[PDB]
């Protein structure tokens, strides 16, 4: 079940989605997901199979009641939202998204919908040495507070921030470095699941470089952010990842 | 008069009890009527809704369109068909931190539209008991009234949430008062501007209290929130407040 899926973030309007939808409509044993935004949601699923997953971006631990501008789990259900982003960077660094934020959510959805937990470091914490301590903080309350059964169900989605934005390139040694440690750090809790659990890289991934980066060992998908807007490009790293998946 | 009625539906209901909502409200004059439903919920509402009833959203983002997850913009605000938009909703300002520098970034986004801003206004139990509430009310339009024209400040909307008021209720003559204090700040900008802006008030706006609120002097309409859901005693209101 090679998951890859694509943040559509803050892009597009009614006429472009439509004309993605159909685009994306285009296939092994393979898992592909798309992440629109919360007013596009039912659009979209009506515009797709129920092959394709889709879920939302952001949703709010918080229980239906007075919380403006949130959507809740219950109200991500009723939409048919099949997964759900949780621990983005953007929402992180642009609205101070904490690891106690990241656990609430996930425990509204943990017993359900499959979740993915989106983690990873800045430049600074790279720089400094602070690698191994915020990935394992970032996973400190998910791990310590959930079982085998729980975990399975979880999707981490590795972005590593220190190469977004900052323009600093990403060799495919330290990429495959840090998804053999993030698995290091579930092998610690048992590893047949730790092997088995799908840990998919969410930094810049292009049509251009789909092969040799799914290719490496520790890779289980791509959580492709603005290549995944097109049809023609999507859709090309979905065949990348059948093939190399198959053979 | 006119009376801008308008209900904001929080965080609540589904796609089966918002069908039941939406056709149930469908039931005025030259009055105004508007609708704040969830983003997950917004086509349905244009879907079921009538077009003179407006439909805005909740909470949007002041950046434009980009690597921004979880948010929502003021073109995707205007795509969807959105005709009103809620700004600095007290709750979003208590529990997502929302300032009054996010408040203006987003409304001076969407006054060059046809788009009403509902800017929301309003002091805790703290800062009226302790006298300052004509501080930390001045403060939040501030930014609004100052970089915006007199032209730019009409048909923006303010909504003032009385926070301070459980089983406590805002006292009804409490509301007037603060109501003119509000429009006398307009007033040092433009008497007239002052004189036509509609400014609704964000409290507990239920059935058995519908002429009283709204007719008191400086009472240009309502933002209802747990008697928006019910459309019987949101109807009412509406209907007590035809005329």
Same mark, same amino acid.
């Given at each position: 079940?090679?998951?890859i899926?694509?943040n559509? =973030?803050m ?12 685009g ?7 898992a592909?997901?798309?992440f629109?935004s919360?007013? +596009?949601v039912?659009? %979209? !699923?009506?515009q797709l199979?129920?092959?394709?997953? %889709?879920?939302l971006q952001?949703?709010?631990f +918080?229980?239906d009641?007075?919380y403006?501008?949130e &959507? ?5 259900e009723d &939409? *048919?939202?099949? +997964? @759900? @982003?949780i621990?983005?960077?953007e ?7 904490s690891?106690? $934020? ?5 425990? =509204? &959805?943990?017993?359900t919908?499959?979740?993915? %937990?989106?983690? *990873?470091?800045?430049?600074d $914490?790279?720089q400094?040495?602070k690698?191994?301590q915020?990935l394992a903080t970032?996973?400190?309350? !998910?791990?310590?507070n ?5 975990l399975?169900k979880? %999707?981490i ?7 977004? *934005?900052?323009?600093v390139?990403?060799? @495919? ?11 290091? @750090? ?8 730790a =092997?088995?659990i ?16 799914l290719?490496?060992?520790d890779?289980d998908?791509?959580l492709? *952010? ?6 023609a490009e999507?859709?090309?790293?979905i065949?990348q ?6 053979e």
């Amino acid at each position: 079940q090679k998951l890859i899926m694509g943040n559509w =973030k803050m892009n597009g309007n009614s006429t472009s989605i439509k004309e993605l939808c159909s685009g994306i409509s285009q296939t092994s044993r393979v898992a592909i997901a798309v992440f629109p935004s919360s007013v +596009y949601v039912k659009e %979209v !699923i009506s515009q797709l199979p129920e092959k394709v997953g %889709v879920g939302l971006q952001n949703i709010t631990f +918080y229980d239906d009641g007075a919380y403006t501008g949130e &959507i809740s789990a219950r109200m991500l259900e009723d &939409i *048919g939202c099949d +997964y @759900l @982003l949780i621990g983005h960077s953007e929402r992180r660094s642009l609205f101070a998204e904490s690891d106690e $934020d990241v656990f609430k959510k996930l425990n =509204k &959805i943990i017993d359900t919908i499959t979740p993915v %937990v989106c983690i *990873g470091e800045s430049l600074d $914490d790279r720089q400094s040495g602070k690698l191994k301590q915020v990935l394992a903080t970032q996973l400190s309350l !998910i791990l310590e507070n959930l079982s085998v059964e729980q975990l399975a169900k979880v %999707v981490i989605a590795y972005e590593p921030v220190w190469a977004i *934005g900052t323009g600093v390139v990403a060799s @495919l040694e330290q990429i495959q470095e840090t998804h053999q440690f993030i698995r290091s @750090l579930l092998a610690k809790v048992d590893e047949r699941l730790a =092997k088995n659990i799908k840990i998919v890289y969410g930094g810049s991934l292009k049509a251009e470089n789909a092969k040799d980066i799914l290719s490496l060992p520790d890779v289980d998908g791509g959580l492709i *952010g603005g290549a995944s807007l097109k049809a023609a490009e999507f859709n090309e790293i979905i065949n990348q990842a059948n093939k190399i998946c198959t053979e």
